[PDB]
Amino acid sequence: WXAXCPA
Amino acid sequence: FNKDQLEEFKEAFELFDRVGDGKILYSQCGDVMRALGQNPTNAEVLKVLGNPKSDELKSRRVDFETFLPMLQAVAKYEDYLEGFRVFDGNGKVMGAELRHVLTTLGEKMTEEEVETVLAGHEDSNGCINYEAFLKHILS
Amino acid sequence: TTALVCDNGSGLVKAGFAGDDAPRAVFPSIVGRPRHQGVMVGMGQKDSYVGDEAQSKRGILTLKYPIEHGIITNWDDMEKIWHHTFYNELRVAPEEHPTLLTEAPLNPKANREKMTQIMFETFNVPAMYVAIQAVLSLYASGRTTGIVLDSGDGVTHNVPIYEGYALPHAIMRLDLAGRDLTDYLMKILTERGYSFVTTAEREIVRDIKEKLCYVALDFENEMATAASSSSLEKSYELPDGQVITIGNERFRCPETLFQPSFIGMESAGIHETTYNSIMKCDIDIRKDLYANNVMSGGTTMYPGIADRMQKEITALAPSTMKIKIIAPPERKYSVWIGGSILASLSTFQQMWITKQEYDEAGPSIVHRKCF
Amino acid sequence: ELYTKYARVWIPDPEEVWKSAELLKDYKPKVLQLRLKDLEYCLDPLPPLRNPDILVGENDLTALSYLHEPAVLHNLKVRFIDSKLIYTYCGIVLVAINPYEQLPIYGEDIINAYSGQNMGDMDPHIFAVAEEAYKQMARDERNQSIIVSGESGAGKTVSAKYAMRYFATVSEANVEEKVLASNPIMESIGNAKTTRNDNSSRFGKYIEIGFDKRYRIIGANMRTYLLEKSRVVFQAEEERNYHIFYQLCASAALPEFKTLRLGNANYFHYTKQGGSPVIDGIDDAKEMVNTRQACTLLGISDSYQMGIFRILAGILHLGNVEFASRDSDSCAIPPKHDPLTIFCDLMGVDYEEMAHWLCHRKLATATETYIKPISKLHAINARDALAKHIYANLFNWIVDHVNKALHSTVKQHSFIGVLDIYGFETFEINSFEQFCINYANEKLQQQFNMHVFKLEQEEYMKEQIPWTLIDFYDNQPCINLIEAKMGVLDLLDEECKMPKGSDDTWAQKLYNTHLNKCALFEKPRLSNKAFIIKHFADKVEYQCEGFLEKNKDTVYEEQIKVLKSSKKFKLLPELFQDSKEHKKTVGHQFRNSLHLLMETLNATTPHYVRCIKPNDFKFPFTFDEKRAVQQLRACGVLETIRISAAGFPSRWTYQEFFSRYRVLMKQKDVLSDRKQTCKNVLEKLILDKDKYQFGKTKIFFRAGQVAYLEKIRADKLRAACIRIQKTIRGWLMRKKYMRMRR
């Protein structure tokens, strides 16, 4: 992703 | 018409009286007019008679004096020739075609009338010279 | 002309033509690169590998996935995976054919924009569309009311749909998926003394997960039982003919979908998220959602998972309600198949975002028209 | 405007589509008085007008001076009842009315009497068109084909008998006998009983007569199109499926059949549905023996005849197979079930393998193979698709053996073709079978409307004056409405796919898409269930009910493989012997097949034969106004009449006009080049050339100008003739005087 997770 | 013609016409008229009263029938009026040199249509004859009913046409009798105004009224070549050229272009006319049209079209005649008009006018081939037939019927 | 219909999972690529019975190319969505200095001059040189080539060579290679958690995260390799699919797998010039692209329901909105831009600029696709997975599962399963549960390699999500109205607030995404089952399986396998460290070695584990794992109907009874006997224990061969032997350790991984605390998620787990997705919906709908529960995606394939889902959800729902689970063996394909149907419907021809309409409007258009 | 007192005029009667009236007082430049029991009448801001009787009874209808449904309707009535003349022409069209009474007219004398003879010169007869087709195949090598069109029950097949028999005589080989012997085969497999008659044709049939380089007949080729596969499974109350089932069922007692283990027709789901097994007036029971004679004479060995009936027993037994459901999702045949047991022993496949594949759908990919259970409704739709897939192949194979016998082993130079296809149609329920029938008739009548326009343009380009004066009715917006994407067939195919779909949701999509968009589609007031199409003839209302179950085929490859393996008898592997075609829905198969037919006929000059069935009850040699009008509308004849009527309907040659109207002549009328005479003479006679065009060959008048020229002919005729009779009586009685006086 961009925040709460690695992607 | 002068008095002499009227006298001759009255004499002829009296010759046609088959009942003896010196009169003819309305139905004889046309025959007398044509016999006296007039050529009225049947329509003209009925018109000058006043479109008479069957009964007076067959039984009412008139003397010459009552006939006379009617004769006067009835009395008062190139079209006939073109009319014959209608039924022709060698100047002849078939007897069969003229017979058919005269007995089935227009003012249809009886076979006896047609046999009396056409008698002697057809040749061995059965052709009528209409100029000759016209001269004959004008005679 | 026919629409190509394409799915990018995290885990696989599933591809074919609209109106096929089943997908025509399947392969892993994986790009390999050589870890090494190649020794032999005059060997052929491969700068990279795409898809199942890399799966063949894997012991020599770094294997990267361009997609994880349903997000495209490095683009120049994903472009390579599509280039491989159109030119090598299906052997079509894509410039002739329209296309469908497939995506998880909440993911970052830039993902749609770039996924559009690649198609129109790079290939000059005639027209395109992007469709929610748990929608297409309903087309495949022949229904217009249900709660889909769909779980990929990389994302899991409920979607309630009722008579063709998708119901946005209802819709809840988890990021548990078969990948995090896999990593957890490696960490438990270390407990029995096997360490599967590298990327290809991870995929070796992933085949174990696909073959041997099953869902405990009662967790506590079998967790006692595995202490009580050999009987559950079962064994498998590594590629080199090593044998490895696995006990309760094989069911315990499926169980992390039911108790995410094992992985250290905070959230409910798929049963409780399903029931909460129902409860967020209106009371009128609910009797019909309970009537249809559609398992989708590959993660649901585990033996018995449907019977676990029914047993656990029963204890939450009111006693009278009929609750019923629907689980066709197709289901791993069912998200492709639904796209196969959808792209063939003549009504759909209105929907394609056309190359003209994009070239005029620009990739913002995908947000407006598509969903 | 001129109508005299004592003209005659036509008025609509409730039960005779027109009645004649006279008009009792002269109309004036809005109220009327007429004699007929005596009535006033009225106008809106005219009645039709009645042809002078000489024109009545003429064989060519476009000879008439005034053209309107009354003038055609009674002219055909008088020709049919009074003169006994069934055959009539309009333009190129030939129109036929079946007597239900045999005639001399088809005799060999007449056959020779037509041969060689130009289309005007005889009186009309069916041979006259075939003769034209032949001589066009002479003049240009191009093929000529003949199109025979009309209601069920109106003698299309008979007109084919005559069209062939003409070539059989005028063209040695058997082929006339062979084809005439073929009929009970195709009529057994392809003809059916429907609400308006038994022995209707449900398919459409096309025969090519083949010729060598010198136009001796060599032989013939049989093609079939537009087969109504959907009837085989499902039916509406009055109806039967195709006769061959009932004939076979009626022979349950007979020993050869006895192993087929048959039952009275009520016993089987496909026959049972209509509750109406008996054809009135004809028992089918012994008609099989006439079919089997026809087959044997036409060379199907008795082994294959037993095979054909074995398969039909198979299909009827298949229909009784039954599905009981575990679930919404899944259904299984009950564990011991009689018709599937019989079906297996008839067709030599393992009971358990059909019991498995009926129940399941397989799905398989390159890596993986899956077996799906399927619901009761899908198991039924599977069985019915299978039954249709057996039947339409069996049909298409029997047609091929008939073709083997009928082909002739010499290179064919060219061919003339005879087409037996069923007319545009209206019933007081209409259903997808009628939707297909009326779709086909739309294409056919387009081909006609365009070919006519070509031939009129040709006849104009014989001549100095241009085409543009012509305009013609155009079918294309309706064709698109049915045919073209997002159209009334397309949404029907789509509703098959969409996950839950019904005649209601289909109708809803129809209205959403079209209802307010296009002038040719309408909803009735009183229901959602149905819709109306304004076809070229008429508005037809079709129900949505049952379009879907009739629309649908999907064959399971894995079921048909079970049969295709069979080892008991050698027909069944041959039927299948032979892709996407397994997918297609009935409506799409019909679209394709109609395009095959239409490109078969677009390549080929048409000739046309109608049939208009004079009365419903089949009373002999008698007529009803109302049916005949409806037929003439449905055959586009009334449309063609109106179109010509505002056209230039009349043609004369200079010779025919001048020779007729010499009665009008006076010597300035005659100048040695007759063209100049007519073209001069008319300039005074009629207001302008706009009424009367001149070509190099011909003289062309507007409508109504004949009746004026007739009137002036009669007027001048009596103007001369009564004046002649006036002199002939005049002199004849002059001579009567001179003879009587002397």
Ligand SMILES: Nc1ncnc2c1ncn2[C@@H]1O[C@H](COP(=O)(O)OP(=O)(O)O)[C@@H](O)[C@H]1O
């Ligand atoms: N039969 C199976 N049983 C259990 N897990 C499976 C099975 N098949 C695939 N998986 C796992 O689930 C994921 C693949 O599911 P899939 O539906 O292909 O994901 P996506 O739809 O995102 O491509 C991978 O992690 C794979 O290892």
Ligand SMILES: Nc1ncnc2c1ncn2[C@@H]1O[C@H](COP(=O)(O)OP(=O)(O)O)[C@@H](O)[C@H]1O
């Ligand atoms: N020209 C004709 N001469 C004699 N009988 C005819 C003629 N046309 C029709 N019929 C009668 O009506 C029927 C018309 O043919 P049929 O094959 O039964 O229906 P169609 O030919 O209209 O499909 C024949 O069975 C016959 O009884």
Ligand SMILES: [Mg+2]
């Ligand atoms: Mg998926």
Ligand SMILES: [Mg+2]
């Ligand atoms: Mg017939």
